[PDB]
Amino acid sequence: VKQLLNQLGHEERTKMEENWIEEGKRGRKPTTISPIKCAYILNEHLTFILFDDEENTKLAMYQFDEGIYTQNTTIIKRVISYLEPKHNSNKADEVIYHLTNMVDIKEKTNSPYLIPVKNGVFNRKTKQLESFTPDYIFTSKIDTSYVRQDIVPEINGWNIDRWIEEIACNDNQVVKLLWQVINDSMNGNYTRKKAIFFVGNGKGTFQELLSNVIGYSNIASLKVNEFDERFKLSVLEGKTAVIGDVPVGVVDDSNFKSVVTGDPVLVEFKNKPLYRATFKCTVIQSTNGMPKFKDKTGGTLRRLLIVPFNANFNFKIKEDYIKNQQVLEYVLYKAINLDFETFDIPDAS
Amino acid sequence: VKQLLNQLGHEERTKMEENWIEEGKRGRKPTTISPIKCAYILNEHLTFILFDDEENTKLAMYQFDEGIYTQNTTIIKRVISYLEPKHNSNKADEVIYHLTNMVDIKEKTNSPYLIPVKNGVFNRKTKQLESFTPDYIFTSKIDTSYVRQDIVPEINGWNIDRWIEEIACNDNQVVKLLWQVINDSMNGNYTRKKAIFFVGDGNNGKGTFQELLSNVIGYSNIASLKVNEFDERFKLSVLEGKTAVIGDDVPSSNFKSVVTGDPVLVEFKNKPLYRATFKCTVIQSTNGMPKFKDKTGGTLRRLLIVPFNANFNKENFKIKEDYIKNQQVLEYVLYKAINLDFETFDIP
Amino acid sequence: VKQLLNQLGHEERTKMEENWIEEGKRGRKPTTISPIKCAYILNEHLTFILFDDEENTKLAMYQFDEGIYTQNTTIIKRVISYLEPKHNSNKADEVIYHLTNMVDIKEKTNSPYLIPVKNGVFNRKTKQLESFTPDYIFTSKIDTSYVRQDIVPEINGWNIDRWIEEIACNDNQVVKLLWQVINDSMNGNYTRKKAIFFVGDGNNGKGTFQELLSNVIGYSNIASLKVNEFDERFKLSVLEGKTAVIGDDVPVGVYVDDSSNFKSVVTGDPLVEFKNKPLYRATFKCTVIQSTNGMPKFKDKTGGTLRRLLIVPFNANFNGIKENFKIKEDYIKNQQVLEYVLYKAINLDFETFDIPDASKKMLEVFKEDNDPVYG
Amino acid sequence: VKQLLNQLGHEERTKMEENWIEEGKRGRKPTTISPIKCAYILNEHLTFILFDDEENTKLAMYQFDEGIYTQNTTIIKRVISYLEPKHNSNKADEVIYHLTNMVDIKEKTNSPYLIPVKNGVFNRKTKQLESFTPDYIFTSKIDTSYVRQDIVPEINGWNIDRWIEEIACNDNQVVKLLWQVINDSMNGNYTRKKAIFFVGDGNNGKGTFQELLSNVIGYSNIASLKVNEFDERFKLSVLEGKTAVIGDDVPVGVYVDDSSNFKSVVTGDPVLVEFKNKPLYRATFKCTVIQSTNGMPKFKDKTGGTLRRLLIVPFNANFNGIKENFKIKEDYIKNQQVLEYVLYKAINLDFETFDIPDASKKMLEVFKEDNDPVYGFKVNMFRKVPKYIVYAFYKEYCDENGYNALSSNKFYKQFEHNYWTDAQRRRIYNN
Ligand SMILES: Nc1ncnc2c1ncn2[C@@H]1O[C@H](COP(=O)(O)OP(=O)(O)NP(=O)(O)O)[C@@H](O)[C@H]1O
Ligand SMILES: Nc1ncnc2c1ncn2[C@@H]1O[C@H](COP(=O)(O)OP(=O)(O)NP(=O)(O)O)[C@@H](O)[C@H]1O
Ligand SMILES: [Mg+2]
Ligand SMILES: [Mg+2]
């Protein structure tokens, strides 16, 4: 879109120059487009939306290349520079404010059957890949492309399914639960209100596999205990999942329950106004043994999930075996093809 | 109101343009409405108020379609942009400041006989629903609509009254007490000076009942607290603008003060302490007798026990997952609770 | 590049003056280059990049004489002043903002086979030195030059290898471990997964070894962080900008309340804080070194916790034997000694930490002490 | 430099006026020197440097009369006002920014053999006084002039040397140690890796000696930090730019649970210094620590490092009677002649390590026994095979109200030292 914005800006500047010429030499030459006019042009020729009408909400822009709306002000300002390079930070803030005033309000789509992938959006109802369109509102996506495959890729004669069964003590129910966990993890715009927890080994390598199948930038590292403090939740924007390693043998249950659910939370930015935002990223936490559960409530056991990790676990597995693109594509394909509505109960736990 | 402001826009602008024309080419074609003129137009053609003369009191705007006053700055900025798009954030702030200087001071209607809901204002004295008017001052309303009803809605052939009776072990007295509890919970301006305790052994439908009671009220109108942390500092802050507080489990002076209407000292982070009166009703659920270490007359009088026991501890998963989310059952229970009137709770 | 930027600034000012003269006198003698034009000139003639596209990411500039990209604002301001002296702080910030909007995004090259030193890049896969190029993206380089070493330097009859042997109490396994520790210390883009703990008491030379490591790495390239201070506000803010971190001292048997952050740091698992920058999440591959007496206990005791730590014995006493102060404040500061140490350590090949027998015995002793169940 | 800058500003303004005259009356006549031209003139004539290339580091200016570079923005702005009085705070900041962009970067002179003194720098290797020059980069100096002394100055019939002898209770080792302590305190780039502790109870004159040290050295050059204050937040920021740190009164028997920062400061070990809401950074402090307290506080670590770092000075003379002379601490130690003589005597004294008095060794041993119960046991116990009998719960904690171990860590006693084995031999009055 850089070429389109450059051409539009050049055309607008030439039109302004001609209009000034026909009015004669009055003052200095107008060479920069007014921020309101820039905002009009951008709203006409691009897709800018507003997630909600809350206090100091941030404008979202549809990235055509990625197909997901973003609230990153740096990318928006780069687009502004594409349209008008002479605008400094203050003028970019002004044009962003004008766009915020004009744009329409749309709610983020939370359809369980639609999951964004780097190649496109996968629909579970038809189990098909569809090209990116602005009509779907997404904030994060998986960075491993979805491809059609019929075999199990093998690197150095290593099978992913057999390895998963080895980690899972070779039981059908637990491996099905693991596949369901992958399916829930890769869904960044929909949540089942389930907080995934890892209890144990093989936990670290599986955690790294999860962090690899999703984009590293899409992954945010946070523990349950550190959700509450100020200036810590702002890192959850545009993140597909949040994975953390809570202390071994150490659990509030404030905002952790809010982010587990789709409930809005008052997120804050440093030297920026606070605003209410909704995060649907899947939460994964790792520790040895049962969490402390200071609350001791039935609803807590209702919402959270427990994944057993018991094994006898070799530096090779860490590198180039879980970071392989083919392995990530295969695991994404296998997990996304699985269809489920309720969680399973493994016989090993 | 966007059409009205747009019509007002580029019409005052034309007046300024023709004034400049008749005054000669000396203003370089002033095409931007001054912030004070924008404030004049907005005050004339809209309804802006100020809740009180407190320091840095935020201007409130009456949303004609919503029927309630809002202090949301973003909506006011959007309205100003509708009048005149060519304003910075600073210029729109100047417009807001001028309006704050101009507008009259009105106090929020805190009448216990008036309850705002999505359809309008319900008056218990007249037992009637009235359309939204700027005369009434409400900062929130119940998101569930209120309509006249004649039958009990059912989803998948499942009743609400039968479900409530099954939760209430099919006793008329406790069913009436539950209806009274809902009636008090929805009313945020009246307390009745009673703390309702749900005592049970398992689920018994108490969790899904609390979920339903949260659903019927607005999402942000409910507060979550337990007994143990009423004494702890900064925990009162969650009661700043709530209508009721409901807990889930219970693993004392401040709690007693919150139960009654006497003021309590609320403290905000990086903000001086101040005393405030809370009329929100408190509902607590737990397994067995709630923990207490100040056994005396006041605590015993203030506490009210509503036992819950059934086979729900069928787990009623279908009821909790989607049945309470249905708009029909929500509006039905809201209407049934709003029609019911009483003076005080009845002991089981 | 100062002369080049001065020449371009003078040429641009002359061109603007000529354009104003031919246009008349309307511009009233424009003499300051516009910030957008300054950004265009700097981008065309210099190498400015953006590490990654997130909120408030700082522009990086390639220092031709240093060979490492720097995000230091002051250096970029000085370069802009070279181009246009008359710009104040706000105009220079505008230039930086325009450059940030204009430049492309490239990620930092994190390959464990490349190690930057004062002379240039060093490649372990081929084991040679290459001249600095903007293609290799580095944020910090080792302050010790890499030269070919033929003989071991000696000052006042003091030999660095003999000093290492004296520190190590004459064991080949532990000297190999020390050399591997140094080699890991230079390489900040890879982790050995095992923490380094210099355990000793009194005049054991652990402080001297830490000072030697700081000198060979460079004082500015190393930051001091505590084992107990791993997770707290405004901490770890400068840790990302340094190749390695060392703990000067650790209390004996000190209890650790947050070792999960410590485990993430040592293992390489992934959050930085700043005065006016939002929190940013990144992995920590810098080696972790702590000097202490005994092995402090940990509340997260397990197989992983025990295996993630390595004990480096320091069983030499230099109080009964007359200590040479010049060893610690004079000898290890010599450039030749540091160059020889860097050459010898970087030429060594690393696969895993070679555990000495004494280290194994002390590890078993700590395992018995921390968990009485095994004992 | 005020006259030079005033003349430069006047001539520059006249030149600008002439340029405006010859270019014709275009707009308002220029009367204020542009910040860039002002910075050019200041760089050409004055001496401005930058200590390092780090983020937003502060420009340093060489004060010709003072002889030391200063980073105080007030002095720099006063100089700028001397050159251009019409510049407000923002324009002065612009001038400072331009100077920062222009000037070159030189590191601080941290040679241990050079000591900045009010008269001039002092070369310890040469034992000479060299005049101030901008080549030597210093940010602080001793507030006492260095002059050649031949005869002891006596004020009101009171001798500083006799007073020093009185403080030490007429002990040559102790007075030698005190002079060595003064010499170490004056030097800010050499540490000697020893912690000085003034131990004495009741009236002794510890505070008087500390005030004498704070008088001979610059008062602003002395930090105030007790040993127990080292490890909490923002405390190390005080140590920055200080030649020595003095703890006025450590609480008696305070529990020093954490000593890492204290040990780092005592030696030349680097440490992470943090300022209040300013970018924290790593730095090395060579300032010596001197603490005065009644009795020796005990440390948690009670290991070899804290023993070797500590030094104890005897203050046994008592003045808690008519012998007390207030003028000694109020007026006598503030005399300029006395301070000059003390500085001369201390700086001319040379040595490489502290000369430990015999009494100090005895008190060091006593503190080792008190802090570490094991060594107290070893001293008090004055056979070999029986370990249980010699253990006996530290022979009932050697009568010191201590806490014992599970007879497992007790054998660390042979670390301090039961040569190894009988098979039949392996509260009580009882060896
Ligand atoms: N091989 C050696 N021969 C002689 N002196 C040495 C040797 N190695 C080190 N030293 C000296 O011994 C001292 C050890 O340095 P230092 O930093 O005090 O050690 P440390 O082990 O950190 N002490 P501590 O903090 O109490 O555990 C210094 O004075 C060194 O110069
Ligand atoms: N040689 C001396 N002869 C007489 N008086 C002295 C002598 N040295 C110091 N003094 C006085 O004795 C007092 C010492 O007070 P100061 O040094 O502050 O406390 P301290 O003696 O170290 N401890 P404390 O008694 O607990 O306050 C002051 O009045 C000094 O002037
Ligand atoms: Mg040490
Ligand atoms: Mg005293």
Which residues in chain D are contacts of C251 at CB distance < 8 A?
Answer: 257-260, 300-301
Q: Among D265, D267, D302, which is best to mutate for testing ligand 1, by the most ligand atoms less than 8 A from CB?
A: D267
Taking the Cβ of residue A325 and every Cβ of chain B, the question of whether any pair is shorter than 8 Å is answered with: no
Beta bridge partners of C313: C199
Which residues in chain A are contacts of B219 at CB distance < 8 A?
Answer: 263
Query: What sign has the CA pseudo-torsion A139, A142, A147, A151?
Result: negative
> 3-state DSSP helix/strand/coil percent for chain B, to nearest 5?
35, 15, 50
The answer to whether C36 contacts A86, with C-beta atoms less than 8 Å apart, is: yes
* Region of C152 on the Ramachandran plot (φ > 0 left; ψ -120 to 50 alpha; else beta): beta
The DSSP annotation for A39-56 comes to HHHHHHHS-EEES---TT
For ligand 1, is residue C210 a contact (CB within 6 Å)? no
Tokens of A94: 């002004």
Task: Please report the resolution in angstroms.
Answer: 3.3
For ligand 1, is residue C375 a contact (CB within 6 Å)? no
Q: State the DSSP code for D304.
A: H
Question: By the 8 A CB rule, do B222 and B214 touch?
Answer: yes
CA separation for the pair D163, D177 (Å, rounded): 15
What is the C167 CA–ligand 1 centroid distance (Å)? 9
Query: How far is the alpha carbon of A249 from chain C, nearest alpha carbon, in Å?
Result: 7
Method: cryo-EM
- Look at residues B312, B319, B212 and name the one whose alpha carbon lies nearest to residue A298: B312
Q: State the DSSP code for A76.
A: H
Q: Give the residue from chain A lying closest to B2, CA to CA.
A: A102
CA atoms within 13 A on the CB side of B14: 6
Tokens of D349: 């004294």
Q: How far is CA A88 from CA A63, A93, A99, C262, D431, in A?
A: 22, 9, 17, 42, 86
Q: Which residue has the tokens 């101040």?
A: B274
Question: By the 8 A CB rule, do D83 and D43 touch?
Answer: no
CA separation for the pair A331, A163 (Å, rounded): 12
Q: How far is CA D373 from CA B320, D105, D362, D392, D416, in A?
A: 66, 54, 17, 14, 11
For ligand 1, is residue C207 a contact (CB within 6 Å)? yes
Residue ranges in chain C assigned as alpha helix (H): 2-23, 35-45, 73-83, 89-102, 160-168, 172-186, 206-217, 260-267, 303-307, 325-326, 335-347, 357-370
Question: By the 8 A CB rule, do D354 and D311 touch?
Answer: yes
The answer to whether D271 contacts C226, with C-beta atoms less than 8 Å apart, is: no
Q: How far is CA B234 from CA B239, B240, B247, in A?
A: 10, 11, 17
Q: Interface partners of D (3+ CB pairs, < 8 Å)?
A: C
> Which numbered ligand comes closest to the C-alpha of D208?
2
Which residues in chain A are contacts of B91 at CB distance < 8 A?
Answer: none
Taking the Cβ of residue A297 and every Cβ of chain B, the question of whether any pair is shorter than 8 Å is answered with: yes
- Look at residues C64, C51, C78, C137 and name the one whose alpha carbon lies nearest to residue D55: C78
Question: By the 8 A CB rule, do B192 and B344 touch?
Answer: yes
For ligand 2, is residue D166 a contact (CB within 6 Å)? yes
Taking the Cβ of residue A74 and every Cβ of chain C, the question of whether any pair is shorter than 8 Å is answered with: yes
Query: How far is the alpha carbon of C99 from chain D, nearest alpha carbon, in Å?
Result: 19
Which residues in chain D are contacts of C240 at CB distance < 8 A?
Answer: none
Beta bridge partners of B142: B117
Q: How far is CA A23 from CA A17, A18, A29, C26, in A?
A: 10, 9, 11, 17
What is the C203 CA–ligand 1 centroid distance (Å)? 4
CA separation for the pair C346, C183 (Å, rounded): 5
CA separation for the pair B35, A228 (Å, rounded): 41
Taking the Cβ of residue C258 and every Cβ of chain A, the question of whether any pair is shorter than 8 Å is answered with: yes
Distance of CA D90 to the CA centre of its chain: 36
Distance of CA B143 to the CA centre of its chain: 9
For ligand 1, is residue C318 a contact (CB within 6 Å)? yes
The answer to whether C260 contacts A73, with C-beta atoms less than 8 Å apart, is: no
Question: By the 8 A CB rule, do C104 and C53 touch?
Answer: no
Strand duo C288-292 + C195-199: pairing: parallel
In a 3-state reduction of DSSP, which class is residue B79? helix
CA atoms within 13 A on the CB side of A54: 16
Question: By the 8 A CB rule, do D260 and D299 touch?
Answer: no
Query: What sign has the CA pseudo-torsion A334, A339, A343, A345?
Result: negative
How many Cβ atoms sit within 10 Å of the Cβ of residue C77? 20
User: Which ligand 2 atom minimizes the distance to the CA of D207?
Assistant: 17
CA separation for the pair A280, A242 (Å, rounded): 10
Which residues in chain A are contacts of C97 at CB distance < 8 A?
Answer: 88-89
Query: D339 φ, ψ to 5°?
Result: -65, -40
Residues 6+ apart with CB under 8 A from D313: D174, D177, D178, D181, D196, D197, D198, D199, D360
- Look at residues D104, D342, D358 and name the one whose alpha carbon lies nearest to residue D208: D342
CA separation for the pair A51, D100 (Å, rounded): 45
Taking the Cβ of residue A63 and every Cβ of chain C, the question of whether any pair is shorter than 8 Å is answered with: no
The answer to whether D101 contacts C78, with C-beta atoms less than 8 Å apart, is: yes
The answer to whether D53 contacts C73, with C-beta atoms less than 8 Å apart, is: no
CA separation for the pair C219, C211 (Å, rounded): 9
Q: Interface partners of B (3+ CB pairs, < 8 Å)?
A: A
Tokens of A63: 């990235």
CA separation for the pair B180, B213 (Å, rounded): 12
The DSSP annotation for D185-246 comes to HH-SS--TT-EEEEE--SS-SHHHHHHHHHHHS-GGGEEE--GGGTTSTT-GGGGTT-SEEE
What is the D320 CA–ligand 2 centroid distance (Å)? 8
In a 3-state reduction of DSSP, which class is residue C310? strand
Tokens of D258: 């954490």
Identity of residue D62 = Y
Question: By the 8 A CB rule, do C251 and C291 touch?
Answer: no
Q: Give the residue from chain A lying closest to C232, CA to CA.
A: A226
Q: Which residue has the tokens 């690899």?
A: A212
Q: How many CB pairs under 8 A join A and B?
A: 42
What is the A237 CA–ligand 3 centroid distance (Å)? 44
Question: By the 8 A CB rule, do C123 and C189 touch?
Answer: no
Residues 6+ apart with CB under 8 A from B123: B113, B114, B129, B130
Question: By the 8 A CB rule, do C42 and C265 touch?
Answer: no
CA separation for the pair B271, C317 (Å, rounded): 58
Identity of residue C191 = T
Taking the Cβ of residue C224 and every Cβ of chain D, the question of whether any pair is shorter than 8 Å is answered with: yes
- Max Cα–Cα distance, chain C, nearest Å: 94
Q: Give the residue from chain D lying closest to C32, CA to CA.
A: D36
Angle at B215 between CA B210 and CA B216, to 5 degrees: 100
For ligand 2, is residue D209 a contact (CB within 6 Å)? no
Q: How far is CA C48 from CA B164, C3, C63, C140, in A?
A: 69, 18, 10, 16
Query: B193 φ, ψ to 5°?
Result: 55, 40
CA separation for the pair A209, A324 (Å, rounded): 10
CA separation for the pair C83, C5 (Å, rounded): 5
Beta bridge partners of C309: C195
Taking the Cβ of residue C44 and every Cβ of chain A, the question of whether any pair is shorter than 8 Å is answered with: no
The answer to whether D54 contacts C72, with C-beta atoms less than 8 Å apart, is: yes
In a 3-state reduction of DSSP, which class is residue D123? strand
Tokens of B120: 């309008």
Question: By the 8 A CB rule, do C68 and C31 touch?
Answer: no
Q: How far is CA D58 from CA A102, C88, C170, D191, D275, in A?
A: 45, 16, 49, 27, 15
Residues 6+ apart with CB under 8 A from D156: D327, D332
Tokens of D303: 């290991």
Question: By the 8 A CB rule, do D57 and D108 touch?
Answer: no
Residue with the nearest Cα to atom 10 of ligand 1? C323
Residues 6+ apart with CB under 8 A from C157: none
For ligand 2, is residue D199 a contact (CB within 6 Å)? no
Question: By the 8 A CB rule, do B197 and B286 touch?
Answer: yes
Instruction: Give the CA radius of gyration of chain B.
Output: 25
Instruction: Give the CA radius of gyration of chain D.
Output: 29
Identity of residue C308 = R
Identify the residue among A99, A101, A276 best suited for mutation to test binding to B, counting B beta carbons within 10 A and taking the highest: A101
Taking the Cβ of residue A57 and every Cβ of chain B, the question of whether any pair is shorter than 8 Å is answered with: yes
In a 3-state reduction of DSSP, which class is residue A331? helix
How many Cβ atoms sit within 10 Å of the Cβ of residue D163? 19
Query: How far is the alpha carbon of A14 from chain C, nearest alpha carbon, in Å?
Result: 19
Taking the Cβ of residue C55 and every Cβ of chain A, the question of whether any pair is shorter than 8 Å is answered with: yes
- Look at residues B128, B40, B22 and name the one whose alpha carbon lies nearest to residue B84: B40
Which residues in chain A are contacts of C277 at CB distance < 8 A?
Answer: 270
- Look at residues C171, C159, C207 and name the one whose alpha carbon lies nearest to residue C340: C159
Q: State the DSSP code for B238.
A: G
Q: Do at least 3 CB pairs under 8 Å connect C with A?
A: yes
Query: How far is the alpha carbon of A297 from chain B, nearest alpha carbon, in Å?
Result: 7
CA separation for the pair A45, A47 (Å, rounded): 7
Q: Which residue has the tokens 């002296």?
A: C85
Closest CB from A80, A88, A246 relative to C94: A88
Which residues in chain C are contacts of A77 at CB distance < 8 A?
Answer: 101
Q: How many CB pairs under 8 A join A and C?
A: 72
Q: How far is CA C183 from CA C118, C180, C188, D194, in A?
A: 16, 5, 10, 33
For ligand 2, is residue D159 a contact (CB within 6 Å)? no
Question: By the 8 A CB rule, do A43 and A103 touch?
Answer: yes
Distance, first Cα to last Cα, chain D:
79
CA separation for the pair A285, A195 (Å, rounded): 8
The DSSP annotation for C127-141 comes to TEEE---TTS--S--
- Look at residues D201, D75, D90, D65 and name the one whose alpha carbon lies nearest to residue D141: D65
For ligand 1, is residue C158 a contact (CB within 6 Å)? no
Strand duo C309-313 + C121-123: pairing: unpaired
Beta bridge partners of B48: B61
- Look at residues D368, D193, D177, D361 and name the one whose alpha carbon lies nearest to residue D263: D193
- Look at residues A140, D237, A239, A253 and name the one whose alpha carbon lies nearest to residue C271: A239
Instruction: Give the CA radius of gyration of chain C.
Output: 25
CA separation for the pair C192, C307 (Å, rounded): 12
Residue with the nearest Cα to atom 25 of ligand 1? D305
Residues 6+ apart with CB under 8 A from D293: D197, D198, D199, D247, D249, D250, D251, D252
Question: By the 8 A CB rule, do C350 and C181 touch?
Answer: no
Identity of residue C36 = I
Q: Give the residue from chain B lying closest to A297, CA to CA.
A: B249
For ligand 2, is residue D267 a contact (CB within 6 Å)? no
Question: By the 8 A CB rule, do A334 and A222 touch?
Answer: no
Sheet holding A48-50, edge to edge: A48-50, A59-62, A69-70
Strand duo A219-220 + A241-245: pairing: parallel
Taking the Cβ of residue D267 and every Cβ of chain C, the question of whether any pair is shorter than 8 Å is answered with: yes
